[PDB]
Nucleic acid binder design. Structure first.
Lengths: 151, 116, 49, 65
RNA sequence: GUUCCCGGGCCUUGUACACACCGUAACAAGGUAACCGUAGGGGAACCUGCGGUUGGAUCACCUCCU
RNA sequence: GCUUGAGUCUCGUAGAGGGGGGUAGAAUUCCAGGUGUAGCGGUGAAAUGCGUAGAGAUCUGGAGGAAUACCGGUGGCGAAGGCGGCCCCCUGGACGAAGACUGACGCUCAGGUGCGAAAGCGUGGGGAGCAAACAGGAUUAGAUACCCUGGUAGUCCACGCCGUAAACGAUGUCGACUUGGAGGUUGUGCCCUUGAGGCGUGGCUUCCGGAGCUAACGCGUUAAGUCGACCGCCUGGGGAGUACGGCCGCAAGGUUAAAACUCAAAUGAAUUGACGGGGGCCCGCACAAGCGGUGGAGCAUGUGGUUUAAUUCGAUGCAACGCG
């Protein structure tokens, strides 16, 4: 607030795979503060989604990430006297954070079975641009073009 | 009709109304367009975007004549005067010359009584 | 061609543009030390790096 | 007033209209005469413009910051 | 990130206020600047036109050239 | 009698200075004709009205009337008011280089006279634009007010009356005296005006200041500073710069210019706060981006209210309601 220029800090990674983004992926899925509980579920989801996708738990996670990753986000930063929105190029520190954010919000959607299978669905579906997680991302994409002109 | 290439387009953005009208080199009027007939009744009559739509109304229903090089002679120092010009350049026209032959008296008659 | 290091281009001159008159002798530009002196003495200005 | 720039332009550039008068003739013939009024705001304006010159004369002597 | 919003604070600007913000006519720019003179009118303050004055306010932003 | 006072002549200069008249050009209104659309005007918004009896708009041609963009400059002339296109006729005021002269012929002044913005009225022409009275649509509790569509006096020219003002850089007029800079504006003398300059001499005017004065602000060679001279004005405000009488006036009024009674103030400059839908900046999860709640459900506690024999009282926007 009014001084913070600082970015993020160091987060304890996942004690299995060498990715802190997957660690960030656990931070958002861990409900009610129970990390270990939701963590072992990331495992039973990442494996099964990667198999329904067709590849490994690293590339089937990447091609399933490129589709749910934001581009822009229009924000209320009016310059003129009119009330409009301004498409904002989203920072790199924020892109994966919002991709993996909507996937878990989509993991609460589709109320089929255990969350390990629900997640296994939404990211495997994300790998093919079908589903409610990617659908969300597509809607924001549609909102960008109608505002991009004020330079 | 009448076959004209050089269309004298008098654009008169007064204060709260902008009229665009292409006429003949001789004087035979071709077609008009106004910020008041295209809609935008209000403080919008004093906006250059309304003048941009005024140029668009003076872009269609005038191709029956078919003007290319037009003498956009602007009158009255008002709101538009550039948004209207580039509306015409993005309409498919080529303005050969933008002239400023605004209604200018040598402080002839007195100005009108309004505004307060 | 620094003014703080070297200085005077005009006879008794503060390069920043504050002291012009030849009344100025030695008084520097406190911001970037320009001792108002002879541009002839600027043929004797040795520096360092 | 009358700008042409042959044909490679794709731009208006009415910069001479403004270098002519534009609002010049308008300032006197848009709202009623009032005769003496403009004169009044001419004095106030000059007082603040000449003081701007006195301002340029006040900054030259120190402004030690 | 401070432009949006709620509260606090510093500097500045203005007041015929400090008893301290039937019609609002003046005093903040009173949100229609004030005042004098001339003619006419209207329940009433005053209003409209014309000439003059400072016993008046801001000259802060949004777009274009080295 | 003599000159540093006033003033005149010889030789020149710039200008919205005044009176009378002529002329050029654009735009607004209207009329006729060619073209063409379904809208024009205006306001915070709306509307009367105009329009299919083809308006608004454009071009060509034409008849009136008022006023002079750009040049424009706290620039210029003038006693002041006041006044911007050009020119012709008459002509005024101000100023300068170098000399010749009468020899203080100088200044102000009650009664008086002349000029006297604008406006009103009588009379002869006149009307594009705007606009008192008035009609209409509304914001509104109402509109004879803001705004708009029409429109008469008037605005313009000439002859008179009223002879009025913030006719106020609020600074009465003539003369003399008093360190400078930036300018603006109009002439001349001297030097290589060789070139957009330098050093002096006068008028008008603006800003910053010294000597000085004052309550302060500030004026400051054009003074609110220092003197001489002349006229007018004030003795608290309101009543009242008005009634009536003299004089003038067709009319509207004006000039000279009071009292009873009443209150214990009236006025001016300068400041700290209160307030701002005035401006800038800084801080806090205020907001932007998210997670979890009350409210929808159950339990526990408390208040208003109700009831009762009694259901103490207190607190009762924030700062009462898991508080005593």
């Amino acid at each position: 607030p009014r001084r913070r220029v600082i970015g993020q800090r160091k987060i304890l990674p996942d004690p299995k795979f060498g990715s802190e983004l997957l660690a960030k992926f656990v931070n958002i899925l861990m409900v009610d503060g129970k990390k270990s509980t939701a963590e072992s579920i990331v495992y039973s989801a990442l494996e099964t989604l990667a198999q329904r996708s067709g590849k490994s738990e690293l590339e089937a996670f990447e091609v399933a990430l490129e589709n749910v990753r934001p581009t822009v986000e229009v924000k209320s930063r009016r310059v003129g006297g009119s009330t409009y929105q301004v498409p904002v190029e989203v920072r790199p520190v924020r892109r994966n954070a919002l991709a993996m954010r909507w996937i878990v919000e989509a993991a609460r959607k589709r109320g089929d079975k255990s969350m390990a299978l629900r997640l296994a669905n939404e990211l495997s579906d994300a790998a093919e641009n079908k589903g409610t997680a990617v659908k969300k991302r597509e809607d924001v994409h549609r909102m960008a073009e109608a505002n991009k002109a004020f330079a | 009709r009448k076959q004209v290439s050089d269309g004298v387009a008098h654009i008169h953005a007064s204060f709260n109304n902008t009229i665009v009208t292409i006429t003949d080199r001789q004087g035979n009027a071709l077609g008009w367009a106004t910020a008041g007939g295209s809609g935008f009744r209000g403080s919008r009559k004093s906006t250059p975007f309304a003048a941009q739509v005024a140029a668009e109304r003076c872009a269609d229903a005038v191709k029956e004549y078919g003007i290319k090089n037009l003498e956009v002679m602007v009158k009255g120092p008002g709101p538009g005067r550039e948004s209207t010009i580039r509306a015409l350049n993005a309409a498919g026209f080529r303005i050969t010359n933008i002239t400023d032959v605004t209604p200018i008296p040598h402080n002839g008659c007195r100005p009108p009584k309004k505004r307060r | 061609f620094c003014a703080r290091i070297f200085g005077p281009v005009k006879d008794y001159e503060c390069l920043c543009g504050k002291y012009k008159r030849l009344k100025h002798r030695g008084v520097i530009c406190e911001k970037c030390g320009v001792e108002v002196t002879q541009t002839k003495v600027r043929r004797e200005r040795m520096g360092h790096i | 007033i009358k700008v042409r720039e042959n044909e490679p332009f794709d731009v208006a550039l009415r910069r001479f209209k403004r270098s002519c008068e534009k609002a010049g003739v308008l300032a006197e013939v848009r709202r009623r005469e009032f005769y003496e009024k403009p004169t009044t705001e001419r004095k106030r304006a000059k007082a603040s413009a000449v003081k701007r010159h006195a301002k340029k004369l006040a900054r030259e002597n120190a402004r030690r910051t």
